[PDB]
Amino acid sequence: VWPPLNLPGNASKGLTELMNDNTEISYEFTLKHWKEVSLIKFKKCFDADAGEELSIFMK
Amino acid sequence: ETKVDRILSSQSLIQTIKNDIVGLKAGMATLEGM
């Protein structure tokens, strides 16, 4: 699937894209809307973690 | 019966108002972001 929350806003069509998990969002489509998602909060972290790749600090 | 049918028909405006307000909500979040 995509991100945990990707459909905050209007138009049930983006909501369709979300609940249906369409692997594609056409540029032609997403041009016709605003705020295609709002991955903005103040709570937690998504899809990543830190504290790796011991190379860089050695440079 | 005729008058209640008239009232029932205008209930279409309510959900139109409903949808538009959803857009006004999202659009305003956009302005608030600025």
UniProtKB/Swiss-Prot annotation, chain A:
<comment type="subunit">
    <text>Interacts with the P protein.</text>
</comment>
<comment type="function">
    <text>RNA-directed RNA polymerase that catalyzes the replication of viral genomic RNA. The template is composed of the viral RNA tightly encapsidated by the nucleoprotein (N). The replicase mode is dependent on intracellular N protein concentration. In this mode, the polymerase replicates the whole viral genome without recognizing transcriptional signals, and the replicated genome is not caped or polyadenylated.</text>
</comment>
<comment type="function">
    <text>RNA-directed RNA polymerase that catalyzes the transcription of viral mRNAs, their capping and polyadenylation. The template is composed of the viral RNA tightly encapsidated by the nucleoprotein (N). The viral polymerase binds to the genomic RNA at the 3' leader promoter, and transcribes subsequently all viral mRNAs with a decreasing efficiency. The first gene is the most transcribed, and the last the least transcribed. The viral phosphoprotein acts as a processivity factor. Capping is concomitant with initiation of mRNA transcription.</text>
</comment>
<protein>
    <recommendedName>
        <fullName>RNA-directed RNA polymerase L</fullName>
    </recommendedName>
</protein>
<comment type="similarity">
    <text>Belongs to the paramyxovirus L protein family.</text>
</comment>
Swiss-Prot record, chain B:
<comment type="similarity">
    <text>Belongs to the rubulavirus/avulavirus P protein family.</text>
</comment>
<comment type="function">
    <text>Essential cofactor of the RNA polymerase L that plays a central role in the transcription and replication by forming the polymerase complex with RNA polymerase L and recruiting L to the genomic N-RNA template for RNA synthesis. Also plays a central role in the encapsidation of nascent RNA chains by forming the encapsidation complex with the nucleocapsid protein N (N-P complex). Acts as a chaperone for newly synthesized free N protein, so-called N0, allowing encapsidation of nascent RNA chains during replication.</text>
</comment>
<comment type="subunit">
    <text>Homotetramer. Interacts (via multimerization domain) with polymerase L; this interaction forms the polymerase L-P complex. Interacts (via N-terminus) with N0 (via Ncore); this interaction allows P to chaperon N0 to avoid N polymerization before encapsidation. Interacts (via C-terminus) with N-RNA template; this interaction positions the polymerase on the template for both transcription and replication.</text>
</comment>
<protein>
    <recommendedName>
        <fullName>Phosphoprotein</fullName>
    </recommendedName>
</protein>
